[PDB]
């Protein structure tokens, strides 16, 4: 009876943060070692760059902390079509659920404008900003972060791992479901939740 | 056993939106009719000003849509002391839960900076921005809005009505609890929830 509610993450799922960070890094520090997308491992890019050479952590962070960085991210392939499709499904409710940087200054505002410009004013109404996704109530959370924790020990949602460069090689127990891309069958996953 | 989680609203509860709007209106439109705080009725100020005279709705909105308006709000009396006290209580979890304007441009960013400057970086981590509070999981919601609705028919929280100029004369059924101000016994209300 109930509609199925789907929480959809922003960076790594709708907005291509990883491609935008690499392109920004190579343009600004053309002389420096970089991490090709295929070689990304672990959720935080600055930690990987820092393991390469300590000062590069600060350098890569200066890219995502710049004015215009979040504003100008390109969409993830197929994301805008899929989210429009999903939003029009009957008895289906969509929210966009995103964690801003602690350096919020050029992040929070740019994220609202990104959604307005790439999706539309109607989607702006459905943004939730939070540093703890476990306190948001939904049936599914589609998110590229490997392991999501916070104050609620047993969240109401099932986490569906959205495949991204940094989690592609990650081994998951059979109980954890993945979405390989927006061409994978996210429609069937929604139906599995309705059925329970 | 569980900690008690308290969602605390921003405008009308921590930040004095109503006093800041009136002061801004009288300074910018000194020649126009105004609504004294004591005479405020109903949640939306622009609707009341619009009922006074149609063009005044647009004029009052121009105040809260200005750069610097959210940034510079004064705190509600006793709010900063009480939220610090509450946050240090054992087995008690606090989040700040706020709805931004659909005209987000000078609202979203200013709200983050308000919390940093009036409360501290630690409180910035606990902001949730949403247009639907019913999908946020907590035990209590302390909020000045008369009636809170959204997609979840039976929210997990009990709404505690925080008294404000615009809701002071509102008659509520005996089942609805009010907080008269931050000098009223919010500590006992938290204990009532722990007990269940
Ligand atoms: N500190 C830090 N934050 C990062 C890094 N990469 C991405 N982020 C932040 C940027 C976004 O605001 C936030 C996205 O979180 P999420 O909503 O779970 O996709 O993650 C990084 O390398 N270091
Ligand atoms: N459109 C409109 N919005 C208002 C008015 N007064 C306050 N607001 C908005 C400003 C805040 O972003 C939002 C606060 O909602 P809340 O989180 O429930 O306290 O309410 C008004 O008169 N008209
Ligand atoms: Mg993400
Ligand atoms: Mg309020």
Dihedral of CA B160/B163/B167/B169: which sign? Answer: positive
Among B71, B90, B116, identify where a domain stops: B71
Number of domains in chain A: 2
Q: Do B156 and B166 share a domain, yes or no?
A: yes
Q: Do A92 and A168 share a domain, yes or no?
A: yes
Of A102, A109, A135, the CB nearest to B108: A109
Q: Do A39 and A82 share a domain, yes or no?
A: no
3-state SS, residue B160? strand
Q: Do A188 and A120 share a domain, yes or no?
A: yes
In degrees rounded to 5, what are phi and psi of residue B127?
-75, 135
| Cα–Cα dist A81/A99, whole Å | 23
Q: What is the resolution of this structure in A?
A: 2.0
| Cα–Cα dist B79/B55, whole Å | 34
Number of other residues whose CB lies within 10 A of the CB of residue A14: 26
Domain region containing A116: 1-16+72-196
Q: What approach was used to elucidate this structure?
A: X-ray
Q: Do A77 and A151 share a domain, yes or no?
A: yes
User: What residues pack around ion ligand 4 (CB closer than 5 A)?
Assistant: B 9, 11-12, 144
Find where tokens 């050029």 sit.
A106
Q: Do A85 and A141 share a domain, yes or no?
A: yes
Q: Do B87 and B182 share a domain, yes or no?
A: yes
Q: Is there a contact between B110 and B70 (Cβ–Cβ < 8 Å)?
A: yes
Q: Do A59 and A116 share a domain, yes or no?
A: no
Locate A86 and state its tokens.
């999903």
Q: Which residue's CA is minimally distant from atom 21 of ligand 1?
A: A44
**Which numbered atom of ligand 2 lies nearest the CA of B49?**
22
Determine the Cα angle at A75 with ends A72 and A78, to 5°: 170
**Which numbered atom of ligand 1 lies nearest the CA of A100?**
12
Q: Which helix (H) or strand (E) holds B196?
A: none
Beta bridge pairs of residue B159: B141
Q: Do A37 and A76 share a domain, yes or no?
A: no
B167 Cβ closer than 6 Å to some ligand 2 atom: no
**CATH code of the domain containing B118:** 3.40.50.1000
* Nearest listed ligand to the Cα of residue B133: 2
DSSP secondary structure string for all residues of chain A: ---EEEEE-SBTTTB-HHHHHHHHHHHH-TTS----GGG--SS-HHHHHHHH-THHHHHHHHHHTSTTTTTTPPBPTTHHHHHHHHHTSTTEEEEEEEPPPSSGGGTHHHHHHHHHHHT-HHHHTTEEE-S-GGGB--SEEEE--S----S-SS-SSEEEEE--GGGTT----TTS-EE-STTS-HHHHHHHHHT-
Give A-chain residues touching B151 at CB under 8 angstroms. Answer: 3, 5, 93
Q: Which helix (H) or strand (E) holds B87?
A: helix B79-87
**Nearest CA to A95 among A126, A134, A139, A132?**
A126
* Furthest CA-CA distance within chain A: 58
Q: β-pairing, A140-143 with A158-162?
A: parallel
* DSSP letter (8 states) at residue B73: P
Strands in B4-45 per DSSP E: 4-8
A167 Cβ closer than 6 Å to some ligand 1 atom: no
Half-sphere exposure at residue B147, Cβ-oriented, CA atoms within 13 angstroms: 6
Interface with chain B: mutation pick from A109, A120, A126, highest number of B CBs within 10 Å: A109
Say if the Cβ atoms of A102 and B109 lie within 8 Å: no
Q: Do A92 and A185 share a domain, yes or no?
A: yes
Q: Is there a contact between B141 and B130 (Cβ–Cβ < 8 Å)?
A: no
What separation in angstroms does the CA of B109 have from each of A110, B55, B70, B164? 9, 28, 9, 25
Q: Do A117 and A55 share a domain, yes or no?
A: no
**CATH code of the domain containing A24:** 1.10.40.40
Q: Do A116 and A34 share a domain, yes or no?
A: no
A129 Cβ closer than 6 Å to some ligand 1 atom: no
């Amino acid at each position: 009876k109930r509609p199925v509610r789907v929480l959809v993450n922003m960076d790594g799922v709708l907005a291509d943060f990883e491609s935008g960070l690499l392109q920004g890094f190579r343009r600004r520090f053309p002389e420096e070692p970089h991490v090709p997308l295929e070689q990304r491992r672990g959720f935080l890019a600055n930690e990987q760059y820092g393991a390469l050479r300590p000062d590069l952590a600060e350098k890569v962070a200066s890219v995502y902390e710049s004015p215009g960085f979040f504003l100008n991210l390109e969409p993830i392939p197929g994301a805008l079509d899929a989210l429009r499709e999903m939003n029009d499904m009957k008895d289906t409710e969509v929210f966009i659920c995103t964690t801003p940087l602690l350096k919020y200054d050029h992040c929070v505002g740019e994220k609202y404008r990104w959604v307005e410009q790439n999706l539309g004013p109607e989607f702006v109404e459905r943004i939730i900003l939070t540093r703890d996704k476990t306190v948001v109530m939904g049936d599914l959370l589609i998110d590229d972060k490997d392991n999501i924790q916070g104050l609620e020990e047993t969240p109401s949602w099932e986490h569906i791992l959205f495949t991204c460069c940094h989690n592609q090689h990650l081994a998951l127990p059979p109980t954890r479901r993945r979405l390989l891309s927006w061409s994978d069958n996210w429609r069937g996953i929604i139906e599995s939740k309705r059925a329970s």
